[PDB]
Amino acid sequence: DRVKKLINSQISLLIGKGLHEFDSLRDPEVNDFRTKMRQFCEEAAAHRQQLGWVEWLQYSFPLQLEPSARNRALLVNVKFEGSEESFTFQVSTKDMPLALMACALRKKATVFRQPLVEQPEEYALQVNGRHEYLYGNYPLCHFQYICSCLHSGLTPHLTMVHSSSILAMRDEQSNPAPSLWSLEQPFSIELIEGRKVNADERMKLVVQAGLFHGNEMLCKTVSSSEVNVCSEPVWKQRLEFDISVCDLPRMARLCFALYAVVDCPIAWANLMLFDYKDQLKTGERCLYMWPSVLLNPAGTVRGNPNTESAAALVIYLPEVAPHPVYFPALEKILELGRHGERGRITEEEQLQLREILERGELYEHEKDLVWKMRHEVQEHFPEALARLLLVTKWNKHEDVAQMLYLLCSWPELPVLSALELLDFSFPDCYVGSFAIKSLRKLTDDELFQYLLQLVQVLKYESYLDCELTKFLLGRALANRKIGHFLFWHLRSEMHVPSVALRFGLIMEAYCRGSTHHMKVLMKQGEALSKLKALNDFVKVSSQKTTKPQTKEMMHMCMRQETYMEALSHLQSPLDPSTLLEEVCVEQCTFMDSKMKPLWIMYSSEEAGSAGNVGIIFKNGDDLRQDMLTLQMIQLMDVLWKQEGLDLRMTPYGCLPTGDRTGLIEVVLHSDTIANIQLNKSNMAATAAFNKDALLNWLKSKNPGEALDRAIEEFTLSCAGYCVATYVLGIGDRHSDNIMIRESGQLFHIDFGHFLGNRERVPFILTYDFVHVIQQGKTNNSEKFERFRGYCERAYTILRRHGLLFLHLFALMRAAGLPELSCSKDIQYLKDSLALGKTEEEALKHFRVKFNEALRESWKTKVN
Ligand SMILES: Oc1cccc(-c2cccc(N3CCOCC3)n2)c1
Q1: Annotated region Activation loop: where?
Q2: Measuring CA to CA, which residue among 85, 121, 89, 122 is closest to residue 103?
Q3: What is the 3-class SS of 430-464, one letter each residue?
C-alpha cells in the first residue's frame, strides 16, 4: 500500500536511519523484535483511539500537579473556545476546576440569554495557547500553572473546551485504516585468527578472554600465546575455562580483549553464550571489535557495524552435544530449586544476620551466613534481596536454581529497591523481569523523573526484545509526554554506533503506535535541521564581520519562506505543552561564546504574555551532563517540596537532540550576575560601592514593599543552589554562569563540571550574595543564620533520599559521561551526603564545612 510506503519513509527520516538498513542485516533477532513490537504498539494505538474524552485528555495532556498535590483570593480569566469574549471572575485557590466551570457557564447563560444544555462535567479547561489542561478533583492551587501564576502575580487565562472538541482531537490524530545440566566438561573455545589488526611491529599480540555474569568473573581469565604483530594474526588454539558447561548461567557473556606487549590496548569484543531463543551458541563467530580508549564486561554484546575498518577476531564455539541445547525452562529451574534444607540456627546468629541485612561489602563468613539464612531473607527481610543476590554463586547451576526458586515467590519491592536492581551488578533476566514488575506501580510523574536513567539501562541489555523495552514502549504509548521524551532520549544518540540499531528499532515501533505524534516529531526535526544550518552560517560569519552584521544576515536567512515555515508552529522539544508559534525574527540573536549558540524568540497571540518563550540552540557541545545536572536539581526541588520546603528553584529545560546538539530553555527577565556587577552608568542600579549593585538592581526591578519578597526569593534560591552545588560537586562557578531573575530568584547555568572533576569541591559562600541576604546591612545575624537554617534543612532532606541519588547515579554509569565513568565519581556523592554517618554527625560535618566557607568568604569581607 502507498500509505504504508509513506509512513516507512517518514519513520526513516524521523529516526535518521533507513528502515531498509534493518532488513539488510538479515538478523532473525531484529526481525522478531520488529514484528512483536509493531504488533504490541499497534494494539496500544487501537486501545487509545477508543479512550473516553477524559481518558484521552489524560493521555494527551497529563496533569501538571505540584509535588505536594500528588483560603486565598484568586482572579481568573476564562473564555469559551474561539470566541474572543472572556470573563474575569474571583474564585478561591482551594476551589475545584468544576466550580470554576459552573461559574463560567452561568455567565455565558446570562450574556447569551439562554438556559444551557451543557453541565460543567461536559468541559475541560485549556491553559491559553498551551497543550495543558486543568481537570480532575484537585484544588486550583495544586496545579503547576495556577501555582506559577500565584507566585509571579499574573492572572490565569483559561479556555473552556467541550467534550466534542477533544473527541474531534482524538479522531483527527488517529492511525491510518488497516540437556544443559548433564554437560560437566569444562567450557572451552578455539581462538582461530584476527583480521585488519593495527599495532607496532616490534610487539606481540595477546588475546585475553574472560567469562562474566555482569561485573563478576565466573572463573579465572585465560590468555592465548603471544603471536608476532601483523595484519592477520593466527592462533588456532584452544582456550579452556575453569567452569563446566552445566554451570554457565543464562546471562553469561564471553568477553575478549586484544592487545600488544613488548600493555598496548588495541580492541575489545563481547558476546552472549546463549542467543535470544535460549540456545547455547555453536560454530564460527566473527567478532567485529571495538577499538580501546582491559576486559570490558559492561560493553555491548553486538559487533562493530563498521566491518570495513574494525579488527575482527574469529572464534569457534564447540558443539558440546549432537542436538541443539537450550537453557532449561523455569519449570525445570523451580523443580531443582524447590529442594534445599531450611536454615535453623540460634538467636546469636539471628542478631548477627539482622546486623548485616540492615547494614557495602561483606566477609566470607558474613556471605555464607546470608546464603544459609536465605529463606529468612525472603520471609523476614524482603528488602535485602539485592544483598542476597550479590552473595549467590552465579557460577553454580544448583545455587542459581535455589536463588531463582525464592525469587519467583518474592514479594514485590518498593520503587527504590527496584531501581537498585536495574544496575549492571544484577544481570539475570529473571531478576531484571522482577525489577520491572516492582516498577509497574511507578506513577507517570515518577517514571518521567527516572526516564533518563531507564533509557541508559537499555545500553546494559543483552537482547533487543526485553521486558524494559516493552515497559517503556507501553508507558510511552499511554502518555504523550512520556512518548515525547522517550523518543528524544533515543534520537539524541542515533550517532552512536553501539546503540543506533537498538534505539532505531525502539523508535520505529513507537511510530507504529502513534502515526500522528511521528508527524508532530518530524515538524520538530525540520526546525532542528534549519537551526543547524542557521547556526553553521553564524559560526562562519562571526569570524568575518561585526555582530550587527551577522545578526542582520541571520535575520535575512530566517525571513526566507523555508525558514519561516520550518521554525514556526511546533511543539517545543524542551516541553510538548509549550507551543512555539510565531518566530520573532527581530528578537533572535546568537551568543558570543565558542559555539555561538542561537537565541530564538517566539510569540503567540492565543497564549498572550505566556506565549513569549525563548529557546537556545547549541551545537558543538555534549549537553548530556548538563541535562543530568538539571534533572538532579529538579529532583532536589521535588524532594524539598514533598517536605513543605519551597527553595524557589529554576529547573529550566535542557535537552540533547542530536550529535553534540541540543536546546536550552530561556528564563526570560533574568540577567547574569557578571552583567549586573559590570555596574554601568546612566542606569537605576548604578552603585557607589560594587557590593551595592545586585541589591540596587533588585530594588529597581522590585520597588516599595515588593523588595522584601525579592530578598526572600534570593535567600531561598541561594540556599537551594548552595546545597545543590555542594552535594553535586558543581565547580567552575563564577558571576557569568550564575543568573538572577527579576523576582530575585538565583539560578545556575552551563554545568560544564560536577562530582568534583578529581578535587573535593568545598562549600561556597560569596560576600556579594551575603550582602543581599543580610538586606545590605554589615551585620544581620538574624537574616544570615535564617539562611544557614534553610541550607541545613535542604541538606538533611537530601540525605534521607541519599539512596535514591546513589541508585540513579549508578544507572547513569551506563551513559558514558567522562565525569561519571567509575566508583571514584560516586564516592563524591557518598562523601557529600555523608551516608556512612548519623544525622547529628553529618550535620556537624556540614556546619564545619559551611563555617569553613564563611571563613573563606570573610577574606573578601576584610577589604
Ligand atoms: O545548561 C546550560 C548549558 C549551556 C549553556 C547554558 C546557557 C548559557 C547562556 C544562557 C543560558 N540561559 C538559559 C536559561 O535562561 C537564561 C539564559 N543558558 C545553559
Answers
A1: 748-766
A2: 89
A3: HHHHHHHHHHHHCCHHHHHHHHHHHHHHCCCCCCC
Q: Quick check: 757 and 826 in contact, CB under 8 A?
A: no
Helix (H, G, I), strand (E, B) or coil at 141: helix
Contact 608, 149 (CB under 8 A): no
Kindly give the interhelix angle for 624-642 and 444-457, rounded to the nearest 10 degrees: 150
Burial of 822 (0-12, 13-18, 19+ CB in 10 A): exposed
Residue nearest to atom 4 of ligand 1 (CA): 750
- Here the cell at position 398 is 544448583
The conformational region for residue 286 under phi > 0 = left, psi -120 to 50 = alpha, else beta, is: beta
Distance CA 735, CA 478 (A): 43
Rounded to whole angstroms, the Cα distance separating 131 from 143 reads 14
Task: State residue 479 phi and psi, 5-degree precision.
Answer: -145, 115
Structural resolution in Å: 2.1
Extract the C-alpha cell encoding 805.
Answer: 541519588
Ligand 1 atom with minimal separation from the 614 CA:
15
Name the DSSP class of 478.
H
Please compute Rg for the chain using Cα positions. Answer: 30
d(C-alpha 569, C-alpha 523), whole Å: 9
Question: Quick check: helix, strand or coil at residue 194?
Answer: strand
- Count of other CB atoms within 10 angstroms of residue 85: 10
DSSP code at position 280: B
Amino acid symbol at 378: Q
Compute the distance from residue 679 Cα to the ligand 1 centre, in Å: 22
Q: Phi first, then psi: what are they for 236, rounded to 5°?
A: 50, 45
Q: List helix spans (H) across 327-383.
A: 330-337, 347-357, 364-372, 374-380
Torsion of CA 793, 795, 801, 803, to 10 degrees: -160
Nearest CA to ligand 1 atom 17: 666
Query: CA dist 56 to 49, 110, 471, Å?
Result: 8, 31, 20
Q: Which protein residue's CA is at the shortest distance from atom 19 of ligand 1?
A: 750
Cell match 523484535: residue? 33
Whole-Å CA distances, 520 to 479, 516, 525? 15, 6, 9
The SS3 of residue 819 is coil
Q: CA-to-CA distance for 754 and 686, rounded, in angstroms?
A: 35
Centroid of chain to Cα 285: 35
Beta-carbon contacts of residue 339 (< 8 Å; ≥ 6 apart): none
How many Å apart are CA 593 and CA 580, to the nearest integer?
25
Pocket of ligand 1 (CB under 6 A): 616, 626, 652, 654, 664, 666-667, 670, 739, 749-751
Residue 141, strand partner residues: none
* Pairing status of strand 312-317 against strand 186-195: antiparallel
Q: Cα(242)–Cα(274) distance, rounded to whole angstroms?
A: 18
Task: Indicate the top mutation candidate among 629, 748, 750, 754 to test ligand 1's pocket, ranked by most ligand atoms within 8 A of CB.
Answer: 750
**Rounded (10°) angle between helices 497-513 and 2-15:** 140
Q: What angle do CA 62, 66, 71 make, to 5 degrees?
A: 120
